[PDB]
């Protein structure tokens, strides 16, 4: 099923990685001291889709792991999806072609952190390293990123284990133009791919 | 009242082809000679794609730097697709150059669709996309077919006398025909989107675009 749910993981910040802008840094004390959280589209409340299902403050960082449930944010999707060049390409070499998923790995291909607040899936994040990988299964997502223990998907294993979308196809294309114009936008999505070890020939990334 | 002024008609012109550009691939060859012997309205699409019209083209002409074209987009489905998406977009809110009135389908279309695109009897249509493959196809909307001839510097006082005999003589259309030429939604508009943020070193040649037909001296263009 294409509107069945879809899992998303990554990190929402890198502790090794120092930003530009002082707003946005995120020592690692502060994480695991103030450690569902919606999950919506680029910090739009009224474009919440799942919920975060899980989260850990890992050696590079605060890993994360959310579920895209809404089925009005998902039929968009899939409408949306087959009408793409992109997705109809399909995936690199072995994995199975999969239109929803691939369509949210071209378009929200970033995480953003919004105690907490919400994360928010978005074309790129402001902080690095914040690629965003989907997938059916969470327990492979989450092995797409090398720098994960066993230990550390053992406690993220333990945590995931009305539709609250209240916006529409017009917002998501009108969202779709700012993404246009982010400077360095593939450049930044590229060089997150070789922070966190993905590559497009193991996973959906699009980038 | 406002949103009326929204979905009225936008026109949209910009170069099809640049003779002084030298492409890299042979297919996108296009030697003023030829375009002469070539050169009833168009159809004006979305991304060559027949169940996107949303226009037809006013005219088209053979001038010093390349072949130059006037479109006009009617379609009140796909304007109307495209005012909706305008409200939501932080780009088109920042809004216009200072002296432009905001006008919010204009800066849509304007950072959605900056490039021009020829359909290669010979001509078959005109695609409004993301960006040319040609370069020095920046696409330039605006309300008044006057104005957008008058954002390209190149374009002589004698090159718009035969543009606008042009336009003003094109009234009612065939693609335009007895009703809405848009035969898609949202939905393909969306995902077209996505296609168009993978497209390489798109805002660079958009940027060598403007500056090269001299749209860079004020206008809706994003880049």
Same mark, same amino acid.
């Given at each position: 099923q294409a509107v069945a749910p879809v899992y998303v993981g990554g990190f929402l910040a890198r502790y090794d990685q120092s930003p530009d802008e002082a707003e946005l840094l995120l020592p690692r004390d502060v994480v695991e001291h103030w450690l569902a959280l919606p999950l919506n589209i680029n910090h739009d409340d009224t474009a919440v889709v799942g919920h975060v299902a899980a989260m850990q403050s890992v050696r590079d960082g605060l890993f994360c792991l959310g579920c895209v449930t809404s089925p009005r944010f998902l039929e968009? +999707? @899939? @409408?949306? #999806? %087959?009408?793409? %060049?992109? +997705?109809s390409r399909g995936p690199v070499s072995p994995l199975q072609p999969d239109k929803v998923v691939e369509f949210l790995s071209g378009s929200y291909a970033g995480l953003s952190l919004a105690p907490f607040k919400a994360v928010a899936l978005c074309s790129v994040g402001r902080r690095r390293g914040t690629l965003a990988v989907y997938g059916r299964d969470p327990e492979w997502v989450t092995q797409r990123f090398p720098d994960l223990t066993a230990a550390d998907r053992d406690g993220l294993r333990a945590q995931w284990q009305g539709d609250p979308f209240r916006s529409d196809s017009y917002g998501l294309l &009108?969202? #779709?133009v700012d993404a246009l114009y982010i400077r360095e936008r593939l450049p930044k999505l590229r060089y997150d791919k070789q922070? +966190? &070890? +993905?590559? %497009?020939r193991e996973s959906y990334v699009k980038a």
């Open positions: 968009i +999707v @899939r @409408r949306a #999806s %087959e009408k793409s %060049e992109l +997705v &009108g969202n #779709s922070l +966190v &070890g +993905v590559t %497009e």
